[PDB]
Amino acid sequence: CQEACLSLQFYPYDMPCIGACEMAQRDYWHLQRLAISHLVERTQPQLERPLTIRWAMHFPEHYLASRPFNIQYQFVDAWFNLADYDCDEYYVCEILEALIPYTQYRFRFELPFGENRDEVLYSPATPAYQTPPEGAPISAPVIEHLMGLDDSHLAVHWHPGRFTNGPIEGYRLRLSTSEQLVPAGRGSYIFSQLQAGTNYTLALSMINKQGEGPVAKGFVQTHSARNEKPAKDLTESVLLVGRRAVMWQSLEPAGENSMIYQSQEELADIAWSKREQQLWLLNVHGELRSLKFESGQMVSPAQQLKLDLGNISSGRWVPRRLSFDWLHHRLYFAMESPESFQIISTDLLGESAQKVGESFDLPVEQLEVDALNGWIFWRNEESLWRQDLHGRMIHRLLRIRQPGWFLVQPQHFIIHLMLPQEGKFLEISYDGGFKHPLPLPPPHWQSFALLGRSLLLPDSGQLILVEQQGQAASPSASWPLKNLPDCWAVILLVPESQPLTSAGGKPHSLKALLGAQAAKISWKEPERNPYQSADAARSWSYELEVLDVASQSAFSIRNIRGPIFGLQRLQPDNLYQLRVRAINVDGEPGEWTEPLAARTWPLGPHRLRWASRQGSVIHTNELGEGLEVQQEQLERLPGPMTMVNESVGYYVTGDGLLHCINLVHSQWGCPISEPLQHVGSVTYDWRGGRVYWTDLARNCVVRMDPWSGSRELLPVFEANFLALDPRQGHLYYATSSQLSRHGSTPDEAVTYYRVGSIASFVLDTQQDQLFWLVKGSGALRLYRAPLTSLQMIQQIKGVFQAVPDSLQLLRPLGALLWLERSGRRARLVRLAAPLDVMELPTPDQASPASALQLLDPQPLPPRDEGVIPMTVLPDSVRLDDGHWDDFHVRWQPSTSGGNHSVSYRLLLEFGQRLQTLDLSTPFARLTQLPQAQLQLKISITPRTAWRSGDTTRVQLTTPPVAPSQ
Amino acid sequence: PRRLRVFVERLATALQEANVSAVLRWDAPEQGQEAPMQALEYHISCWVGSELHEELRLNQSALEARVEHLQPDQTYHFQVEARVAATGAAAGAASHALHVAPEVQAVPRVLYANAEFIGELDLDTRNRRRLVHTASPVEHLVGIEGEQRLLWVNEHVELLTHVPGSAPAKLARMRAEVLALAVDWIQRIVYWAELDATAPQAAIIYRLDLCNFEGKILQGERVWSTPRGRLLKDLVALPQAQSLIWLEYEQGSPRNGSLRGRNLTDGSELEWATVQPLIRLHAGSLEPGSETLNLVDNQGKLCVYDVARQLCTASALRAQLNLLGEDSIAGQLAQDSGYLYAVKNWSIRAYGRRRQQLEYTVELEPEEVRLLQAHNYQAYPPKNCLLLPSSGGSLLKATDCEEQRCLLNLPMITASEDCPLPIPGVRYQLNLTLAPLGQWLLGAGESLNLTDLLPFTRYRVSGILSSFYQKKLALP
Numbered sequence A: 001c002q003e004a005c006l007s008l009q010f011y012p013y014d015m016p017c018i019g020a021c022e023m024a025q026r027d028y029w030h031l032q033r034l035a036i037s038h039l040v041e042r043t044q045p046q047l048e049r050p051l052t053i054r055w056a057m058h059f060p061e062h063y064l065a066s067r068p069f070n071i072q073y074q075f076v077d078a079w080f081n082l083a084d085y086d087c088d089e090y091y092v093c094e095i096l097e098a099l100i101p102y103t104q105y106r107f108r109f110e111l112p113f114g115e116n117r118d119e120v121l122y123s124p125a126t127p128a129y130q131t132p133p134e135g136a137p138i139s140a141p142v143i144e145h146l147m148g149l150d151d152s153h154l155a156v157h158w159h160p161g162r163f164t165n166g167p168i169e170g171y172r173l174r175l176s177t178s179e180q181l182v183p184a185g186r187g188s189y190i191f192s193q194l195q196a197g198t199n200y201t202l203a204l205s206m207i208n209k210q211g212e213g214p215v216a217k218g219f220v221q222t223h224s225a226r227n228e229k230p231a232k233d234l235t236e237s238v239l240l241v242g243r244r245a246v247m248w249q250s251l252e253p254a255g256e257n258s259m260i261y262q263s264q265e266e267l268a269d270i271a272w273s274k275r276e277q278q279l280w281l282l283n284v285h286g287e288l289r290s291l292k293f294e295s296g297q298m299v300s301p302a303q304q305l306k307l308d309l310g311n312i313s314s315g316r317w318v319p320r321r322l323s324f325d326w327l328h329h330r331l332y333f334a335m336e337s338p339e340s341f342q343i344i345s346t347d348l349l350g351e352s353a354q355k356v357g358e359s360f361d362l363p364v365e366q367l368e369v370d371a372l373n374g375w376i377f378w379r380n381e382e383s384l385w386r387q388d389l390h391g392r393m394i395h396r397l398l399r400i401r402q403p404g405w406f407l408v409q410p411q412h413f414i415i416h417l418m419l420p421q422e423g424k425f426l427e428i429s430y431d432g433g434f435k436h437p438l439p440l441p442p443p444h445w446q447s448f449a450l451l452g453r454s455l456l457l458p459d460s461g462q463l464i465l466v467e468q469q470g471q472a473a474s475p476s477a478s479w480p481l482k483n484l485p486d487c488w489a490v491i492l493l494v495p496e497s498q499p500l501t502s503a504g505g506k507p508h509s510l511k512a513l514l515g516a517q518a519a520k521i522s523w524k525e526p527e528r529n530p531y532q533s534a535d536a537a538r539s540w541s542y543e544l545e546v547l548d549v550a551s552q553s554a555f556s557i558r559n560i561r562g563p564i565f566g567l568q569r570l571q572p573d574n575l576y577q578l579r580v581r582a583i584n585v586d587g588e589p590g591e592w593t594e595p596l597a598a599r600t601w602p603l604g605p606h607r608l609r610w611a612s613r614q615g616s617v618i619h620t621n622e623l624g625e626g627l628e629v630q631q632e633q634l635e636r637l638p639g640p641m642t643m644v645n646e647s648v649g650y651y652v653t654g655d656g657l658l659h660c661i662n663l664v665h666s667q668w669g670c671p672i673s674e675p676l677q678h679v680g681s682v683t684y685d686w687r688g689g690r691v692y693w694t695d696l697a698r699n700c701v702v703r704m705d706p707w708s709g710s711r712e713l714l715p716v717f718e719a720n721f722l723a724l725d726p727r728q729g730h731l732y733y734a735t736s737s738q739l740s741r742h743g744s745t746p747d748e749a750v751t752y753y754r755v756g757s758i759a760s761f762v763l764d765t766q767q768d769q770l771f772w773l774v775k776g777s778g779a780l781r782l783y784r785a786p787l788t789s790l791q792m793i794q795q796i797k798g799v800f801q802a803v804p805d806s807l808q809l810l811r812p813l814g815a816l817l818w819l820e821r822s823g824r825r826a827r828l829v830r831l832a833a834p835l836d837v838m839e840l841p842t843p844d845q846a847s848p849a850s851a852l853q854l855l856d857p858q859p860l861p862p863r864d865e866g867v868i869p870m871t872v873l874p875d876s877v878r879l880d881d882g883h884w885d886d887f888h889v890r891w892q893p894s895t896s897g898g899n900h901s902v903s904y905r906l907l908l909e910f911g912q913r914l915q916t917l918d919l920s921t922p923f924a925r926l927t928q929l930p931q932a933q934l935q936l937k938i939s940i941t942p943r944t945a946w947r948s949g950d951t952t953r954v955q956l957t958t959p960p961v962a963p964s965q
Numbered sequence B: 001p002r003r004l005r006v007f008v009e010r011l012a013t014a015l016q017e018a019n020v021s022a023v024l025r026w027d028a029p030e031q032g033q034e035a036p037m038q039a040l041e042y043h044i045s046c047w048v049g050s051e052l053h054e055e056l057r058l059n060q061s062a063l064e065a066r067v068e069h070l071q072p073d074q075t076y077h078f079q080v081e082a083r084v085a086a087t088g089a090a091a092g093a094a095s096h097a098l099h100v101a102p103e104v105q106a107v108p109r110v111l112y113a114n115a116e117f118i119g120e121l122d123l124d125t126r127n128r129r130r131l132v133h134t135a136s137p138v139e140h141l142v143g144i145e146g147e148q149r150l151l152w153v154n155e156h157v158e159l160l161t162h163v164p165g166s167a168p169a170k171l172a173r174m175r176a177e178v179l180a181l182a183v184d185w186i187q188r189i190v191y192w193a194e195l196d197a198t199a200p201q202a203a204i205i206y207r208l209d210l211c212n213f214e215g216k217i218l219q220g221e222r223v224w225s226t227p228r229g230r231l232l233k234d235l236v237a238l239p240q241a242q243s244l245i246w247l248e249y250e251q252g253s254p255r256n257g258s259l260r261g262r263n264l265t266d267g268s269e270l271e272w273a274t275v276q277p278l279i280r281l282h283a284g285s286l287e288p289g290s291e292t293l294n295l296v297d298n299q300g301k302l303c304v305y306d307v308a309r310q311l312c313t314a315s316a317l318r319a320q321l322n323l324l325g326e327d328s329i330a331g332q333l334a335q336d337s338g339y340l341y342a343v344k345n346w347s348i349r350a351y352g353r354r355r356q357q358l359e360y361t362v363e364l365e366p367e368e369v370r371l372l373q374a375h376n377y378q379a380y381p382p383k384n385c386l387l388l389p390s391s392g393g394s395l396l397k398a399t400d401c402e403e404q405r406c407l408l409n410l411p412m413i414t415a416s417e418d419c420p421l422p423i424p425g426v427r428y429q430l431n432l433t434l435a436p437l438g439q440w441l442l443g444a445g446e447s448l449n450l451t452d453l454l455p456f457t458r459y460r461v462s463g464i465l466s467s468f469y470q471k472k473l474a475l476p
């Protein structure tokens, strides 16, 4: 439209011709999109198989005038542009792109309409087509969890990768060397017989029918070796519970083989406590005797404790089993109906009883609880099961005929189980899919004990101390057990049998949001492994340090009971290093985190203006607190508010409408009555005192006096965002493709950038630099250029991106802000440290945010009378002609207040003849002088770089021209 | 209906910037036999993203157009509308979008040599040319394609060249059976191998420099030789790896092929590891940092050798090439940057490298192809590396002198530390003076030997350095 509306009178840009041409073209493409929108959005493209999409459409009539249509592809398990395709006029498209094999795909069409980026149509998606499988896998299998169970074993859980490139066959594990193939259904492996106290390296690879994929790398320590107590220095104590005689025994060489409790009734099950030292005794009839002891002897007798049945318990239920939670201080019971086994948890008083699970006919031989790892295990004669403490998730571990007495180690995460019918060692993990043998010395024991690497096997007269490889006929030490008929329960009385310590912790993902004198910090908790439950407890206290780099001083604050912490009393404009650790109940803390360079805001009342998607506006500080809900009510989806003076502001909404608002008194102040459609952005020049906006329908820039509403079209084309430098009058504009400069003269026009698309920019007038955001294909790339070295400051990858016109320059901090497209987060990048991207969360009263501005502490300066051109004196416009062909017009030169460059624009009227001139002197030569004494009309418009003066219109008589040569 | 066929080509001349361009070929729509041949006005709009790159209006009977100045690694959209030019009625429309990727895409053109001539077979349009008419048939054929130069060995055992626009020039005449032929395109050195017919038969590698050719018959120089009883086959020159790789086999055992070579700078012998003995070797991708080799073992299977990792590499073209049989993969196999060509059952099959599928199959006569060669992308160094260096430096190093003579060594010059490859066509020119006594115009690699010097006497040598490209550009 610049080349169609080219006139020799108004040069170089006939502005209303160009504006009418551009608005008619956008009206044409809007009416074409509204015509063909239903036929696009009903018709589904079909796939057939080179791969061919048939769409039941046709190319438009002005087909080369529009933008390219894009086939877009989507993984079934955002839309990216397909690069290689071949379409004819009936949309019978052939994909020449090398697709990823064995990946399902969906395809759609994008039809743009003209050069306007708003007018696109999207077709519906195709039915899902999977690529046929070929070749090696290209995605490494990402490990979920990888840890050492104990000093000899190592556990890994993983998931398959994204592009398997074939049907899945097997995963290959290499441990450095130990190699093992596992099939496709299993994603968890546990190694064995490792060295203690060295780290191993695990290399995991994916294998399909065609080949082997890439290799995933892992560094993982085993547990250190436990201290081996000999027979001469064995200081442990055991409590062996038989059915009719219970005896406590010392594992010293001089040990006391001493009576604690004899019961003539047969006891069905026991429950053992560590801090209380209480052995609850449940007999064969179902009544419960709570029996407190102390260090192997009586301090209190047995008390009959009655369990509440309640409205859960409809029928008769006779209890048989016992287990005591050492975190929750709660018991768990298995009960017998006289017709099924149902397990009901209860309190120590016995009143708060609630069932878990469902009833089953199998008899539970032993009930044991891992209170640290959050599990209750029931073992019956058919299977061993695993339940969480709230009864939410149910799992069965192993099916076997008649298992014997199992022992759960919480920090080893290995159930050691001993069938007396087999007579061989069995290790089950907590998921139950790992079953392992070990050597056992031959005798059949009903129960056992594990003490480090040592194994205690109770004989009918003695006790056998082995190390699972030496023989049971020659123990290292023996203790007499002659008064016991048989040994159904052996309890090892160590503090490691019931620990409160999870023995693993390292915090991560530490985030610090800083203010002038305070900081809010949040860190992620260390995640749970699959071996413990959601009912497992890791209740900790976190210790945080601030390391001042100015004084090099480390201050540590401890006992923080949550992951969020509001730290106060920081000196402003100072940088620190902030590091967190997690301390357990036992006082063993975690390791250090990596420190982040945390610089505070400088001192001052730094208020941020948030605007919602519903038009509510609030003022916070830079931490997001201290909120004042403002009195005014904006329209729906507003952009950043541009202030002219302290009462009148201008903003753009999400549909392109431009609105004026008077904050103080709403009855007067806005010079334009109606909102104006198709506006990209808005800005204001305080020195000229002019409001500049991009009219997107006219691809022009409109300059408006805010005191009168007089609008001037200004020759800047296809612009979206504006910022004007008030020192020199240069306008800076950003298109969708390029970012450049427009001055008063054509010599000052310089192009800074050409490309995704430019999302926002901001002008730094003081330091003479410029920043802009390029919103590419899933990567926000931020840049910097001087106003006279182009570098990329920071590239942020992800599906989340910025709102267009949302990059502001935080002057006091020296940072850049952009609101995210979800409206619940803002991102801040400092200039001195480019790599750290702090996030500011959004206050919940304005929950989807559409605008965020930094309010300046000084007020806005008033308009300058030093840039206003004075009016040209109409008496001084003389038509003085010289000799020969010099027929010219002169006037007294218009100045400004401050001495600025005043150019002129001039119009001649010889009746119907017209002539326009652009001048830089008070002088114009008239060429095509008609010689027959007409009344010339002269109009002068003086201007500066910032604004324009008034028009001087005179009418002058021509001097007589006798020669015509 | 006939579809729009767009191929990108990357054409690189030495001392010039590589130019990547798009060749568009579209056939005409079907016309009646009563109507004559009509002019079709083809309108092309080329788009980069959302902006317009080029726009051309052409009156052609069938569309053969070329869009210049494309950029690598960017998606372009060519929108072609075909109208009848006399009436304005729309004959058709097409929309080709194209990621460029010039390492995997090229124009499907081969150079075929029968007993009569050497021609170009474009596999898209199925059209044959004749570049040069040969009086005697061609046995081996290599080329330099920055200057469109063909180099070949005839049946009368003579090595010849051809530039377009001239006669076939005789380069060398040699007196033994030539087993293989190769060219370094950068340094303009032609390497071949001659049979040595002693009772342990050998093969001697001869080299010739193209910068020393001024119109008369040159003679080769012996550089290396194989150990005795062994023979060469399929010489491939790798300039950016600075290697000369052949298939060394022992006489009487041709299916024991082992990948041997020399290093082109210092002359050291180099070995490459294969998992199986070989029968045949062909040149690969020839791209810097990713050079391959297509090599066939004794069971008639192919590996794509990565020569930096020295390993076989799995591809989707490998099973489709191994399905053709041993004689097709062992007889004629060529690879340019975009395709990979085999000859099976009087038909040339072109397999694409990007899409990894069979793209073209062109039937032949039973004696149209005896030799096949491809327009492989000969990647040139940048303009500071090919040319004469700026700084002089102490390139001349004096050895330990005797009283009678000094062995002045003439090494080979790289332009800077940023240029790893040698400068082409290096000629020292020396005055000898008593600190002229002697004048030499001598190339790089040899030595100057400096006889009849007086004992206990200082001497001086002074020399200018010249290259082929500074004589071509008339630089000082």
Ligand SMILES: *[C@@H]1O[C@H](CO[C@@H]2O[C@@H](C)[C@@H](O)[C@@H](O)[C@@H]2O)[C@@H](O[C@@H]2O[C@H](CO)[C@@H](O)[C@H](O)[C@H]2NC(C)=O)[C@H](O)[C@H]1NC(C)=O
Residues within 6 Å of the ligand: B039, B041, B057, B058, B059, B085, B086, B087
């Ligand atoms: C492509 O050709 C058209 C048509 O060419 C005319 O018809 C042919 C059958 C043949 O007889 C030609 O010589 C004729 O010119 C061109 O359109 C013509 O362009 C000229 C030059 O601008 C103009 O004076 C004529 O009026 C046009 N005629 C018609 C019928 O439109 C067209 O310009 C050619 N394109 C290019 C790039 O040269």
Ligand SMILES: *[C@@H]1O[C@H](CO)[C@@H](O[C@@H]2O[C@H](CO)[C@@H](O)[C@H](O)[C@H]2NC(C)=O)[C@H](O)[C@H]1NC(C)=O
Residues within 6 Å of the ligand: A644, A645, A646, A647, A648, A668, A669, A670, A671, A706, A707, A708
């Ligand atoms: C801020 O500026 C605006 C002009 O843009 C002022 O609004 C004018 O106010 C007077 C007095 O209320 C009205 O008579 C005018 O009609 C308003 N102008 C227009 C164009 O409508 C406003 O007063 C200014 N506020 C301050 C505090 O100076």
Ligand SMILES: *[C@@H]1O[C@H](CO)[C@@H](O)[C@H](O)[C@H]1NC(C)=O
Residues within 6 Å of the ligand: A199, A219, A220, A221
């Ligand atoms: C294992 O030891 C190496 C050797 O320095 C070290 O890099 C690594 O951090 C250690 N791994 C663990 C898990 O401690």
Ligand SMILES: *[C@@H]1O[C@H](CO)[C@@H](O)[C@H](O)[C@H]1NC(C)=O
Residues within 6 Å of the ligand: A897, A898, A899
């Ligand atoms: C502008 O020019 C006038 C006239 O020369 C002079 O008096 C004045 O100092 C200049 N500067 C300003 C800032 O007004």
Ligand SMILES: *[C@@H]1O[C@H](CO)[C@@H](O)[C@H](O)[C@H]1NC(C)=O
Residues within 6 Å of the ligand: B011, B016, B018, B019
């Ligand atoms: C490449 O472009 C150069 C000019 O920059 C030109 O001289 C040369 O012939 C071109 N080569 C081709 C035809 O690709």
Ligand SMILES: *[C@@H]1O[C@H](CO)[C@@H](O)[C@H](O)[C@H]1NC(C)=O
Residues within 6 Å of the ligand: B253, B256, B277
């Ligand atoms: C092939 O050659 C290798 C390398 O010389 C040699 O070890 C081997 O014996 C040969 N094999 C046969 C069958 O001749």
Ligand SMILES: *[C@@H]1O[C@H](CO)[C@@H](O)[C@H](O)[C@H]1NC(C)=O
Residues within 6 Å of the ligand: B241, B242, B243, B263, B264, B265, B266, B270
């Ligand atoms: C060839 O020689 C050069 C110069 O010494 C050396 O840098 C290079 O590594 C050698 N090439 C190979 C493939 O060994």
Ligand SMILES: *[C@@H]1O[C@H](CO)[C@@H](O)[C@H](O)[C@H]1NC(C)=O
Residues within 6 Å of the ligand: B345, B346
């Ligand atoms: C091979 O070529 C001959 C030529 O006549 C033809 O008859 C035959 O069908 C071809 N074989 C195949 C498999 O195409």
Ligand SMILES: *[C@@H]1O[C@H](CO)[C@@H](O)[C@H](O)[C@H]1NC(C)=O
Residues within 6 Å of the ligand: B407, B446, B447, B448, B449
């Ligand atoms: C003498 O000159 C020849 C020819 O370049 C060279 O090969 C040789 O090494 C020289 N030096 C001697 C014999 O020391």
Ligand SMILES: *[C@@H]1O[C@H](CO)[C@@H](O)[C@H](O)[C@H]1NC(C)=O
Residues within 6 Å of the ligand: B429, B430, B431, B436, B439, B462, B463, B464
């Ligand atoms: C050697 O000296 C002669 C005699 O002056 C001169 O023509 C020639 O150019 C000289 N060579 C060099 C390299 O200067």
